[PDB]
Structures are given as structure tokens and as C-alpha cells.
Design a protein around this ligand. Sequence first.
Ligand SMILES: OC[C@H]1O[C@@](CO)(O[C@H]2O[C@H](CO)[C@@H](O)[C@H](O)[C@H]2O)[C@@H](O)[C@@H]1O
Ligand SMILES: OC[C@H]1O[C@@](CO)(O[C@H]2O[C@H](CO)[C@@H](O)[C@H](O)[C@H]2O)[C@@H](O)[C@@H]1O
Ligand SMILES: OC[C@H]1O[C@@](CO)(O[C@H]2O[C@H](CO)[C@@H](O)[C@H](O)[C@H]2O)[C@@H](O)[C@@H]1O
Ligand SMILES: CC(=O)N[C@H]1[C@H]([C@H](O)[C@H](O)CO)O[C@@](O)(C(=O)O)C[C@@H]1O
Ligand SMILES: CC(=O)N[C@H]1[C@H]([C@H](O)[C@H](O)CO)O[C@@](O)(C(=O)O)C[C@@H]1O
Ligand SMILES: CC(=O)N[C@H]1[C@H]([C@H](O)[C@H](O)CO)O[C@@](O)(C(=O)O)C[C@@H]1O
Ligand SMILES: *[C@@H]1O[C@H](CO)[C@@H](O)[C@H](O)[C@H]1NC(C)=O
Ligand SMILES: *[C@@H]1O[C@H](CO)[C@@H](O)[C@H](O)[C@H]1NC(C)=O
Ligand SMILES: *[C@@H]1O[C@H](CO)[C@@H](O)[C@H](O)[C@H]1NC(C)=O
Ligand SMILES: *[P@@](C)(=O)O[C@H](C)C(C)(C)C
Ligand SMILES: *[P@@](C)(=O)O[C@H](C)C(C)(C)C
Ligand SMILES: *[P@@](C)(=O)O[C@H](C)C(C)(C)C
Lengths: 531, 532, 531
Amino acid sequence: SPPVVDTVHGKVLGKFVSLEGFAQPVAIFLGIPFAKPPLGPLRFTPPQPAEPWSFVKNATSYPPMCTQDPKAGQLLSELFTNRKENIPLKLSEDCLYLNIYTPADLTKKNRLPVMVWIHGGGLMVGAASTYDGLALAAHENVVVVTIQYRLGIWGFFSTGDEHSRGNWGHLDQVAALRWVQDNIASFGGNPGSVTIFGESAGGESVSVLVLSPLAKNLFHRAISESGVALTSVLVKKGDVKPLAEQIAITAGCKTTTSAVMVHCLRQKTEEELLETTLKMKFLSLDLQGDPRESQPLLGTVIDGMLLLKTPEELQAERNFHTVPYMVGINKQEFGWLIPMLMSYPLSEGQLDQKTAMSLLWKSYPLVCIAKELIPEATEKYLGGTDDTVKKKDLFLDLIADVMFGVPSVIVARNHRDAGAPTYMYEFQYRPSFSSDMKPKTVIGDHGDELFSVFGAPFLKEGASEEEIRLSKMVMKFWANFARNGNPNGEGLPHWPEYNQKEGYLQIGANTQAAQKLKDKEVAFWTNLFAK
Amino acid sequence: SSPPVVDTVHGKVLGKFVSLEGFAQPVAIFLGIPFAKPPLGPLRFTPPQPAEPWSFVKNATSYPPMCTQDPKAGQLLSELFTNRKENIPLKLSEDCLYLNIYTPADLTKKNRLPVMVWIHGGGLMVGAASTYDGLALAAHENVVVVTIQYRLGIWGFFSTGDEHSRGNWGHLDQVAALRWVQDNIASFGGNPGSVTIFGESAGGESVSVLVLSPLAKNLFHRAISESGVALTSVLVKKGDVKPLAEQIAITAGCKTTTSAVMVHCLRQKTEEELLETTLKMKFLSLDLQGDPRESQPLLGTVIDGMLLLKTPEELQAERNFHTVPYMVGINKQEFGWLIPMLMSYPLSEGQLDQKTAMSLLWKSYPLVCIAKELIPEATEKYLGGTDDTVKKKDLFLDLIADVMFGVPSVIVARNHRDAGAPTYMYEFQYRPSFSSDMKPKTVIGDHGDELFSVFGAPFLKEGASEEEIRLSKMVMKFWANFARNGNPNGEGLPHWPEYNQKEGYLQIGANTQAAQKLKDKEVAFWTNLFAK
Amino acid sequence: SPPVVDTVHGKVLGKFVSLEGFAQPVAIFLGIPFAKPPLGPLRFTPPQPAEPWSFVKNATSYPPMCTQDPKAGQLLSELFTNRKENIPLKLSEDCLYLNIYTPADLTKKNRLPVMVWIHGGGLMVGAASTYDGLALAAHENVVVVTIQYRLGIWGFFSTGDEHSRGNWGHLDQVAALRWVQDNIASFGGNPGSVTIFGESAGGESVSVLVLSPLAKNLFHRAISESGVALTSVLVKKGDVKPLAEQIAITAGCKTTTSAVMVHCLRQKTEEELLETTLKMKFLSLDLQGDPRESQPLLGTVIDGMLLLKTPEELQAERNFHTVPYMVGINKQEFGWLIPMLMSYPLSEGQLDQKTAMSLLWKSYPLVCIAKELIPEATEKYLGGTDDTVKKKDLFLDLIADVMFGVPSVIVARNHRDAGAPTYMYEFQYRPSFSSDMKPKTVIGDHGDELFSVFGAPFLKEGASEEEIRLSKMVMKFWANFARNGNPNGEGLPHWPEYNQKEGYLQIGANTQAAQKLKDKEVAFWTNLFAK
Ligand SMILES: OC[C@H]1O[C@@](CO)(O[C@H]2O[C@H](CO)[C@@H](O)[C@H](O)[C@H]2O)[C@@H](O)[C@@H]1O
Ligand SMILES: OC[C@H]1O[C@@](CO)(O[C@H]2O[C@H](CO)[C@@H](O)[C@H](O)[C@H]2O)[C@@H](O)[C@@H]1O
Ligand SMILES: OC[C@H]1O[C@@](CO)(O[C@H]2O[C@H](CO)[C@@H](O)[C@H](O)[C@H]2O)[C@@H](O)[C@@H]1O
Ligand SMILES: CC(=O)N[C@H]1[C@H]([C@H](O)[C@H](O)CO)O[C@@](O)(C(=O)O)C[C@@H]1O
Ligand SMILES: CC(=O)N[C@H]1[C@H]([C@H](O)[C@H](O)CO)O[C@@](O)(C(=O)O)C[C@@H]1O
Ligand SMILES: CC(=O)N[C@H]1[C@H]([C@H](O)[C@H](O)CO)O[C@@](O)(C(=O)O)C[C@@H]1O
Ligand SMILES: *[C@@H]1O[C@H](CO)[C@@H](O)[C@H](O)[C@H]1NC(C)=O
Ligand SMILES: *[C@@H]1O[C@H](CO)[C@@H](O)[C@H](O)[C@H]1NC(C)=O
Ligand SMILES: *[C@@H]1O[C@H](CO)[C@@H](O)[C@H](O)[C@H]1NC(C)=O
Ligand SMILES: *[P@@](C)(=O)O[C@H](C)C(C)(C)C
Ligand SMILES: *[P@@](C)(=O)O[C@H](C)C(C)(C)C
Ligand SMILES: *[P@@](C)(=O)O[C@H](C)C(C)(C)C
């Protein structure tokens, strides 16, 4: 008999599903609206509250993913999904929905911890439905909420002023959190213990929320997986007006004033703005053209509502709610997936110094390394060997450090020094669910931890006992953090706290504490970037 | 000698005077008074908003446009229903939320006359207020007659089945008009405390629905449904309306990703575009081939949660709704000629044999909703009686008529009676002389025939016999007496029994007299049949 | 260091500009929004408050001029600008801006008198940027504010009823005055002493505002230069519906109803409405067709909001907050500029009684003289001689008396008879900045006083000592009126109050007082029009 819950705006009908072995069924709700569809005049404006509905709303089918490149979008979904078969998704501007997976007995009044997931995809692609919360829900007895937010132009078009401040996608995330606060108890969730976690752009979002005074009170714990507010490619610093003009022109709009641009873009069709998106060619390494002018994506800006100053200035301000914060990275963040997605010219599998330097310059939009610093950086990472293959790999290590390693550690340190409980980890394992095209030597590639965190071993086939073991351990760690703000618990390897000693957990076949993660690196980059 | 100027809440309005043979006091007529904000652009598919107030004097002297509809079908129905000498041609427009007022009072005085608000019919698809001239009824009965318009078809009833487009926009328009009457009618010499809503067909269904709506409680004090009620299933959509909404969206060239998307896309179509979409859907017409259960005759009333919280069938038994005197009536031959002729029925031969009868009844599913299995019983019960092919054709017409109006009307009346409210019923049997030449002379009490008596056609049109004039005078008296007392009885009229347990009704025609248990058998049969 | 002011809606950044002769630099803020951009659903509706902004708004570039005939607008801008080089402008519907010139030292607290300028252009063209308030502000130590308001179809389209009452352009002027009341103090101005002044359509706007209850208490002193509410060509009386339908059809809109028309027009792009504007051929003399049907422009209407009754009815009504009002005219208002802009058939420089009567009839939309009265009028002016060249010049003084001369005197008389301080003046000078295509005999042509009032001599090149001193005198007269409601001051010739003696100031090479301005003319016309 279909589970029915009363939300603030009306009743919703879900479905029961059982995970082999668990007696307690899991109540699943799909496509619950947490805001009014941002259509027509609502485009490029803050999300507004959803209109209440009368009878019972069937929440039993996957919501559309926000408008995005269908090729790249379907591709990322197939790569990150933890469910047996990838589900086809529709595209729409009407995408402000969230999915709920609750193991609570709805006939009673449960108050289980809530874990809100924020997907990645560079703020350009991605969807909530990609991640099935069944296993994590059943296995750790927590409520899992997958949320969506506007992407690309729709979610981040900014004119740098009041006519289109920006960060709509982040405001969308804040709206979902507020929705959780007002409705989660009805789904056996405890609104007083909400944990936000997400990877890549989702991790950067978590990081942004953590620094935003607007979101303060909507969550109690946070987890950033391979992505923080200091992952520069995701945060636009400076004048965002030129980008706005570039988009407006591409879409066939006048650029007389900001209001004109926004009004014009508001009158273009969804399908028309998708074409402008394809023309801009985001998430792709531009091989010709001043690298200092390529915009790999539209992102987070300093709008004056969500963020009042740069992420950097906000940290040194020790001004932000201090909640337990887990920040982690993977051994090889730029190992395969990202270079593959952006079409890096690494067809050869080799790289010599001069070519690495040229590549590093081309990669400017991702690492922002001034042309005069290239020799020092490249020399520091590749100079130690003559093996052209190892240079290519160390080259990939160089990128990962500037985009994820150093930023993540710098963030953790500031959170820590601010007085709040902090924890770090470095995932190093090669999931069997990896793509067939990914070289077998890549271990701990971007996104690899998603399979352990979301229990892919229990939803997909072929997991060895070792993989199944790693997954369970990881879910208990995440869930333990969810309830106590401390990942530790009986039967799990000790996870030291990230204090001045900087201990962190190395996760993989062998999991054990260690210290001073990326210490030399942070020293090298903070110093180089100072010049 | 000087046009009448009335001050309303929203502004001053200027009407004109019109005299009628037999009355000294000219009637003040005001045409096209706005009672809502024009439902254009973003307002399409949303409740009606209050009209903007205006400065100076608004000229209410020309007929307003009629809501977008099939211009051809709309002119035809208007010509067969109009009570004036010559039918008045109308323009089409989305800007159509207007009402016409005909007051017999002297506006230099303080009159407080009973008000009668008319709701035209036309299957919620076509129709207009201007079709009906209240001049005669207003003068002859000293009552204020108000004819209202409301959004039709797609504009008035498009429903996605959920919050993005609940539907019933046309019904909400009717409510908005009644609300307007309550705040302004006193300036026209009317009594806001004595408003009677009446209408026939879809108009009768509207009235019936308003009686069951918590949204209209306290906006009217008496109701009259003529040939149409909430149980006239063809006008009430029961089930999942999502599929129809999608068939409409696709026919208009819209995506159907979600409801919000459908509504957003339809809101951007032009009136001509939505009009073409209307024509392609072929509403108000019987489809001869394919599956009958899938053919959609029109967009109608739905259970939205605002206007109607449950199905009419449920709301009646609830004994939960402000009770007001209610008059429910029907004509002797509802499916006699007009409806079949309009919906283009395959009765071109005048003859019908059992086999052909059972097929026709199955094809008429959207009109009579009878499971293909029940067909035999229903057909035998009506046609089995004889072997004359022509007589079978007639008995078939009485079959359709009892399913669409006859029985529902009596059920609605019984439940209203059992709910503890004053109920009255009638059965009109007369062949107006204003009838169309293409109408078989054997047809008496066709659909819409009482409209000529009620609106006093004999006093506007030409050639009425003293017999027809007298039927009209009697009916207007009964209607107006009901308007002012909730009881049609008064001096100079045959006794109209109340519809109590004895179920006595009034037979109106050349010879008007009381009778009892109208359609008692039919109700029994059909209730028993639909009980499968 | 750039000046930064705090306004209700946010901080604005300007720039300092020094003027030869004054130590204190003048702070100039360009393009400050005073209303929300009137786009989309806001077209043909009252102006709305501007959306507040975060951070610092850079008010340092000229704002667009409201959509208009770009060829006519640039021409008028050039002929009227007081700066050396005319500044080319961009077109936009996003034009509700104002420019501020404050000579106050924003570090201290100043309460300087404020002068708000309302440009002209027949309500069809014009811009605020054309006028530089640098000279006036610095020389007379007042805060100068130039504003903009919707023009043509955008600012005056009227269906004659509630669906589109009209006078949007006038409602904009009122919104800019409220802005001043709420923000001017931050710029060193005194909201308690605001003087509104303008010329031509700007003159008529000021006149209208003096009669409107929507504007009472938004200003304390008024100055109408060559334009008043009785200047027939700018005020539409009677059924305006015909013009509305004519515009709708020209734009390809059904005329079914008022609401339907306005709705259709609201869906037209700026380009489409501009094309309609051009086809309508406004501000141009129509040679062919019934003069009683030609419509030179879209103008002020009796909407029931801004104006409850016609200007004539409101004057004798003695019902309108009284303020010191100054009404003036130029010696030859129809000398060159206007006939040139409207393309008058005066290609021969001569005119015979017959041709004269033809034009006077064709000129109906401007003078409104019934065909039967043409003889009595042409005879009065031209009948004095036989000289065709002398006749052509009298014909011009005939048009000028009807359009500006008479109307002005009457307005001033009624204002006076209502107990309000009144002042009149006749400008009789030929600025050296005149156009080359302008006949050298023309003295005191339309807009000639502008160069004196805005101190053109201190911005442009080649002004003789005579012209420089004239401008200095005019600015003091104007500024004294601004601070006192009386133009007189030490060193300036005596300016009599326009009382029963009807004294006025003749301004030019020799500035002196005189009496009964246009007395004969008024008498003659009042009497004629009575027929
Ligand atoms: O992508 C083509 C092809 O290139 C190889 C080397 O032959 O891998 C390179 O490119 C990958 C991303 O596209 C990197 O992850 C990898 O490290 C680099 O050597 C092949 O493995 C791949 O099939
Ligand atoms: O001109 C009308 C004509 O139609 C006929 C035959 O087609 O009547 C049939 O159809 C009518 C409606 O279209 C029905 O009312 C009628 O009962 C049916 O026999 C002729 O009988 C009539 O003269
Ligand atoms: O451009 C027309 C041309 O006409 C002349 C005489 O040839 O002047 C007449 O027309 C002017 C309108 O442009 C009037 O202002 C002027 O008063 C009239 O004599 C030339 O001066 C002028 O270039
Ligand atoms: C047309 C469509 O596909 N939308 C789905 C909707 C909502 O969109 C839910 O929120 C799921 O997204 O739910 C339904 O089941 C429902 O309410 O009857 C219909 C359909 O399954
Ligand atoms: C003065 C006024 O506002 N009334 C106008 C009416 C209104 O639309 C009424 O609502 C419908 O009679 O319609 C006209 O405009 C029209 O085009 O025939 C004429 C009239 O001037
Ligand atoms: C984009 C541009 O170059 N125009 C300028 C506009 C102006 O306000 C108006 O468009 C014209 O006055 O916006 C600014 O003021 C601003 O908000 O920082 C500065 C900007 O340089
Ligand atoms: C929602 O569920 C009800 C009953 O389970 C069903 O009638 C309805 O059609 C469903 N929604 C859809 C797919 O239309
Ligand atoms: C029609 O309305 C107009 C208002 O524009 C009014 O002047 C006129 O008198 C009305 N028609 C008549 C002749 O009554
Ligand atoms: C305003 O801020 C600075 C100060 O002059 C200026 O350089 C910048 O261009 C302006 N802001 C914008 C629109 O970038
Ligand atoms: P993430 C997978 O959401 O985005 C990447 C970090 C990027 C390099 C910006 C595409
Ligand atoms: P009414 C004549 O307005 O409409 C009929 C009842 C229908 C069958 C729906 C056409
Ligand atoms: P003003 C120069 O703004 O406009 C003139 C008075 C006109 C004659 C209408 C062009």
C-alpha cells in the first residue's frame, strides 16, 4: 500500500522498495517540488515558494534534469550513477525538484539524521536522479535527499549588478535546504540534524554554503568531496560583465545595458538558450585562442546576497557558522574523467617538458598560472624524471593539486583554525564499476568515492568482497559523521581529527590514519602564487 | 430624455433608454460592463482578477465581444436561441468578461428590485450574453436582469489536473460576476439581498455547480436550472484529465514535459492559434469511427479542490452546502432536434433498427456514458416496445434525453429536497412559433424551447398568437415570483406544487397543470442499470 | 579620489570635474536609475521604484536616451547642447535615468538649492545628457539635475481609458522628483528648495506639473521656457481613441478593444515600435491630407490621474498649490529651428496672402485655427504690407504668437491672478553658437536662451565678452529665483514682478524692464478663437 505523507504544500504519494536483506522497506518519493517553476519572468530571479496543491500528488517518476548539454549530461550520469541501469532523463527549465529516500517507519514519529546530496557537473550539467539513495538509506538508517538546482546560463548568468546578480543555482540549493527544514520531519527526518554533502561542483557548493551567512541554520554538518570554494575554476573573480556580454551577443541580444540583456535573454526560448550554450562550448579545453579568455563554464560570483566578499576574504574573517566539516580528495583527481570530458590532447600517453608547459598555459582557465610561472611549476613537478610517461602523469598530478589538493587543505586548515571540528581524507581505490575506457592504472580518479559512499556494490553487480567491504566502511563513516559530527565509531579504523597535527584518513583497500596531507604542495603553491 | 448615468464601485457608467409597448417607464440598458480584469497574457488560465477602476464616464452602449469560440457554431446557436427579432452578430475576443444589465427601475429613485442573473448555455464551448435581451422580462416583471459572460473552451476549462492549471476558470468567472452584482447592483436599482441565478443547458449545469460550491455560498439566494445539472455527466470530467490536457498541448504545438511547461507554452500561443487548436479538436461533434470511449466532446467542469472539493454525486449526499430554493426543470423532448442537428447525428433517414440503434448508442458514449455491455438492456427497454423503424428512432431520442437531462435533473431535485431545501420542478411542453423551419413539426418541447417564454420572445419577435403570449406571461410571472420569494406561486396562476415527498411537479404548456412523480420509472431503471 | 554617495538604494561612484575659475571641483554622477526599467509588462504603466543594488554602482557613463527617431534626436541634441562636442547617444527603453552636478563639498554637509531640468523635444525626442550642468552648478553654486522620461509611443500612448490612461512620460518626471526628495540631500542639495525648469515640451511639462496634484510638494519653484500647458500642440483634447487605433494598426495590431490593443503593443519589440514611430512621421508638417486629422505628435492627455481637467479649466479653478513661477518666451520662437525641424515649405523666403492662408490651414495641428478664421488672422498680420519677404516673416511671428507668445502670457496672468508670485521675460539675443544654416537676421530663436542659462560660453569656444556676461547674468537671475523665488539680486538689473502692471524683463544685449507683453496679440486672439 502506497505511502502518503503530508507536506506543507499538500500530500505526496511515494512507493515502497526493498533492498535485498532488509525487512524495513524504504519509502521513496520522486520529484517533489520545493519551489515554483522558474519559467518566463521567473528566469534569472531567486526561487520562489511552490504553490500548494489540492489532492494527492503522485511523486513516483523521475523529474527532468535542468537544461544542459544533453550529450555531456547523459554521459556524466552514466559515469557517476550507482544504480544498475542508467535512467534516461528529460531536460527542462521546470527542474526544481528533489528525491527522498527514507528508511523510517512513517506510521511512527522518527527523527533520523538527514543527508542532503548536491550533485556535481561543473554547475553546467548533472542531475539528482543520477544518485539512488536506497542503499545508503537502508544501510545506515538515515534519510537521503537528492536535490537539483538551475545550471549554466539559467543558474549562473550574472551581469554583476542588480539586474541579474547571479548565483541562482546556489539560491536554489538554499531553497531546498529550507524545504527540508520545513518538511523533513514528515518523512521521518530530523530537521535539527541535516548534513549537506556533494562532490566536485557539489563540493564547491557545500563549501560556498558553509561560508554563506544566508545558509547558516539550514545544515549542521558538511562534507565536500573533491571540491571547495577555493577551486578557482568554479568561482568568478573580478568583472563578470564581459562574460555576460559574450553570452548575450551569442544569443543574439543587444548589450546596451544590463537590464536590456536580461530582458532579452528572458524572452529567448529554453531551446534557444540551449543552442547558445552549445555555441559557447563550455567544459572543453580550448586549444587555440588566448587561454586567458576562455570561459570553461559559468559559475559562482560575489552577488552580495549569498556571498558578500570572495571566499578567500570570508575565511580570514573567521565569520561563518562553524559546523563539523569533512573535506576530502582523491589520489588522482585529474587521472582520467576530467581530461577525458574536456578533451585533453593526451592521445600519445606521453609528454615532454616544452609540451607540458604549453599545455599548462592552455589550462590557464583551470589553474590560473601566470605564463611566467609556468617554468617553475612544470620544473617542480616534471623536472625530476626523463620518462615522458611519468612526466604526463606528474603533469596530471600538477593539475589535481592546484584544482583540488591545495585548495581543499587550505580550506580545512582555515575551518580548523576557526575553531570548528574538521576532518580530512584521501580516497585511493579503483571501483570495478569504472568505465571500460578508463586506463586500469588510474586509481582514485575524480568521482571514484561516489561508488562507496552511495553503495554501488549493493545496487550494481560484480563487486568483490573487498569492494563491498570498502563501501560499508565508507557509508558508516559518512553516516556516523551525519549523526555525531565525528566519523568515528565501533569497528572502524580510527580517523584522527584534523587539528594542528593534520592527521587524515587514507581510504582504500588499506585504510589508516596519516599526517600532513599535501603539506609540501601547499607550501610550494602558496609561495609560487605569491610572486 | 437624457441617458442614465450610474456610479459603481469602479467608476461611472453610461447606458441608454429603451421603451417597451405597454410600459411608461423606459428600461435602462447598460451593455458591456467589465466585471473582471481582461484575462490576457499571463492571466490566461488563472482565476479572474478585479477590474481596474476608471475615471470619467465609461460608455456601456455597445454589445461586448463574445469569448473566443467556434465563430460558426456560436453564431448558429445564437440565432436559434436569441429572443430578439434579429440576431445580433458578435466579434470574438479573449477580452470578454463583461455583463449586460437591464433595469426597469427609475434611476432617479431608490429602487431595490429582485435581481436575476442569467448564465447562457452552449456546452461550455460556445455562447454569449448578448444573445439574450432582458428588456421584456425586466419590464414585465419589474426585475433587474443581468446576463453574464465567462471564459469558454480551452480558455475557460483547460485543466492539467494539478496546481499549475486547476481549471474551471469559467466557473470562477461566474462567481466573480456574482460578486460584482453584490457590490454594485444597488446602483442599478437592484436588491443585492435577493439575487437569483438561472441558466439553461451548460448554464443550467453552471447554476447546479454553483449551488454545490462553497465559493459561491452567499452570492445568490435562489437558483434555477433549465435542462442541465451537475449530474449531466457530459459536462463534468471525472477521472484523470491529464491525458486531455496533453492531447490539447500537442495539437497546439507544445511540449508536454510537465504540466507547468504545458501551461507556460499554451499561455504563449495567440488567440488565433488557440482558436485553430479548438477547431482541430472537433469538440461538440460526434465521431463516427474508432473507439467512442476516447472521443472528447468538450472541455468541462472538473474537481479542482477550489470550486468543487468532490464530485457532485458526493456533494449532494453531504447535506453540506448552503441550501436555497432551487427550481429544476426539463423539456418534453430535450434531444428532439436541436442537439442532434448541431452535433451532426447520423439520423438522416428518419429510421432506426435495433442493430443500428445499439451502434449509435455506443458511439454516443461521450454523451450518455453507457458501458457497451449495458447497451442491449437500455436499447431493448426503450426500442423493444415496437417494430416500427421510425418509432424506434423516436424512442431512441427519448433514451438520450432521459440519460442527459431527465433523470439527472430528478436525482438532483430529490437530493436537494432531501437536503431540506425548497425544491420545485417543471416539464415544459410547447413548440414555439419562432422555431427553425428545418425542425420537424412533430417536435414539441425541444431543447431551448422554454427560452422564448422565459425571455418573453412573444414581445420582441413577430407573430405570436395570444396563446403563446399567455404562456410567456405565465412563465415570466412564475420565474419572477420565485425570484422574489423562493416560491413561484402568486395570484393569477395555476398552483405549482412544491417538490416534496409526493414529488409533484408542474407541466407547462398550452394547458398548464400539476402532476406527480416526474420520470419516476426512468430514474428507477437507469439507477438500477448504472448500478451494473 | 572619486566621490561616493550613499543613496537609499545603494552607493554610487562619480567623478570630479574642475571648471576654470573655481577651486572646488564639481562632483558629477551620470546615469543614476530613479525607476525600474519600464520593460515587458511595465510598458505603458506607471514607473516603479528601482531595485536596490549591492556594492558600488559606477555612475560614470552617459545613459541611453529613450527610444526615439535617432536622426531627429541627434539633430536636436546638437542644436541644443551647451558642451563643445556633442555626445552621441545609444537608444533604449531602459532610459529612466538622471544626471547630477553638485558643486558641494560632500565631505561637509550642504543644503544647496536644487534645479531639476526637463528637456524638450516635443515629447518625441531628447535626452538629459545633451545638457551639461557643470557651468551653472559651479557658477551659481546650485545642484543641477537633468532627468529623462519616456517619449513618443512609450511615454504617451493612450487608449483614453483605464487600460492605458497615458502620460507615462509625465509620471516619470514625477518619479524623478520623488527620487530627488528622497536622495538629493546626500548630494549636498536641499530637498526643501527644488526648482523645476525646462524649455518647449519641457516648458509644457513644468506647466503641467504646476497644475497637477500628483506633483504638489515635490518642487518649490517653476520656470517654463517657451512652452506651457496652453501650448495646444502638446495637449490632446477630445477623443484620443482614433490616434491609438491608428498607431495600433500601423504596428499590426487588432483594434477589437482597448485591452487587446495595449496587450498587442506590449508584445512588440523596441525595433517594431520604433519603425511604427518612423512611419507615423511625427514632428513633421503634413502637406497632403486633412490638417484636422494630421497628428504631429503623441502628447499630454487628460488622464484623470495627472490632470483631472483640461489646463484651461484648472487655471481659472484657482485650485493648485501656488509656487513662484517664471514664464518666458523668445523674440522669434518660430524663427528658424522649428520650421526647419518640421520641414516647412518656406523654400522661397517669400509668401503671398493666398499661400499664407494655405499654410496657416495646413499648420492646423500647431495653431488650431479653423479654416474660416484663417483670413481674419492672415489679414491681421500679413495685411500690413505687400512685400512678400516681409509677409513671410510676419507669418512666422503669427505662428509664434499662437504657439508660445499668447499661451505664455495667459498662463502667467492666471498664475498671477491666483495670488502666486509671477515673473515673465522675453529673450532677444542671437547666440554665436547658432547653426550656420540659420539666417543671420533671426534673433531670439527657439532655444536661444539655453546657451545663456546653461553657461555654454564657459564650455564652448569663441564667446565674446558680451555673450559671457549675458550668460553670467542669466544664471544668477535663474539661481536667485531658485534660492529665493525672486530673480533679483545685487548687481543685476531690476526684474519687476508680473503683477497687474504686467511688467517683464527684456533680456539681450540691453537688459531692461518693460510692460504688457503680447497684450495686443492676446486681445486679438482671445477674441478670434471665441468665434
Ligand atoms: O584518450 C585517448 C587515449 O589516450 C591515452 C594514451 O594513449 O590516455 C591519455 O588520455 C587520458 C584522458 O583522455 C588520460 O587519463 C591518460 O592518463 C592519458 O595517458 C589512452 O589511455 C586513451 O585511450
Ligand atoms: O431538415 C430536417 C430533417 O431531418 C430529418 C432526417 O434527417 O430528421 C432526423 O434528424 C433530425 C435532427 O437532425 C431529428 O430531430 C429527427 O428526429 C430525425 O428523424 C427529417 O425528419 C427532418 O425533416
Ligand atoms: O532650408 C530652406 C531655406 O529657405 C530659406 C530661403 O531660401 O529661408 C526660409 O526657410 C527657413 C526654414 O528652413 C525659414 O527659417 C526662413 O525664415 C525662411 O526665410 C533659407 O534661409 C533656408 O536655407
Ligand atoms: C507528467 C509527468 O511526467 N509528471 C509526473 C507528475 C509530477 O511531475 C511528479 O512530481 C513527478 O515528477 O506526477 C504524476 O504522477 C501525477 O502527479 O499524477 C504524473 C507524472 O508522473
Ligand atoms: C467609454 C468606454 O470606455 N466604453 C467603450 C466600450 C467599452 O469597451 C465597454 O466596456 C463595452 O461597451 O467599447 C468601445 O470602446 C468600443 O470599441 O465600442 C466604445 C466605448 O467608448
Ligand atoms: C555597462 C556599462 O558600461 N554601463 C554602465 C552602467 C550605467 O549605470 C548605465 O548603463 C549608463 O549610465 O552601469 C554602471 O553604472 C554600474 O552599474 O556599474 C557602470 C557601467 O559601466
Ligand atoms: C497517480 O496515481 C493514480 C492512482 O495510483 C493514477 O490514477 C494516476 O493516473 C497517476 N498519475 C498519472 C500517471 O497520471
Ligand atoms: C458613447 O460614449 C461616448 C464616450 O466616448 C459618449 O460621448 C457618447 O455619448 C456615447 N454614445 C451616445 C451618443 O450616447
Ligand atoms: C566601477 O568601479 C570601478 C571604479 O571606477 C570601475 O573601474 C569599474 O569599471 C566600475 N564597475 C564595473 C562596471 O566594473
Ligand atoms: P566537477 C566534475 O563537477 O567539475 C569539474 C571539477 C570541472 C573541471 C570544473 C569540469
Ligand atoms: P447545452 C445546449 O449548452 O450543451 C449541451 C448540453 C451539450 C450536449 C453539452 C452540447
Ligand atoms: P519643443 C522644441 O520640445 O517642440 C516644439 C514646441 C514642437 C513645435 C512641438 C516641435
